[model samples]
Target: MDNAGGVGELEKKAEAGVQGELAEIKKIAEKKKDDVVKILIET
Candidate 1:
């Protein structure tokens, strides 16, 4: 594979994976909204 194309595809896959993880985390955070606030305050 060409270097530029390979790197671009890798980046695209990584970004999509991150977005999926973030979406899952958002759902969990929504359920524990109060806990998130408390953690933020403690930090």
Candidate 2:
């Protein structure tokens, strides 16, 4: 963990970007799950 001045800022930004990535994935996954679930049972 070699860091100099302004080094910690990158770690924060990296985590934020990953958080966005995971959030979007969760949204899309649930959206797909809902659509696929609706077709399972119908008269």
Candidate 3:
């Protein structure tokens, strides 16, 4: 949010967050599609 370096740093941070969240979700859903469905249904 500070934008100290420019768009590059901000973009990298955003991308990293997205990748981390994706990895977490994938790990949790590996053989548990039902769990994912439950989460989606709750959301």
Q: List the residue pairs that clash in candidate 3.
A: none
Residue pairs in steric clash, candidate 2?
A: none
Q: What TM value does model 3 have?
A: 0.52
Clashes of each: 0, 0, 0
Query: Taking the tens digit of each residue's C-alpha lDDT, what string does model 2 give over 3-43?
Result: 63565778777888899899999899988887788776541
Ranking the candidates on lDDT from highest down gives 1, 3, 2
The TM-score obtained by model 2 is: 0.56
Question: Which digits, one per residue and each the tens of the lDDT, describe model 1 over residues 1-43?
Answer: 5556777879988998999999989889886996878799987
Every candidate's lDDT? 0.85, 0.80, 0.84
lDDT of 3 at 37: 82
TM-score per candidate, in order? Answer: 0.48, 0.56, 0.52
Between prediction 1 and prediction 3, the one with superior TM-score is 3
Off by over 4 Å in 2: 1-8
Sum up the clashes in candidate 1.
Answer: 0
Error of 3 at 1 (Å): 19
- Give the per-residue lDDT of model 3 (tens digit) for 1-43: 7555668878988999999999999887874887778788997
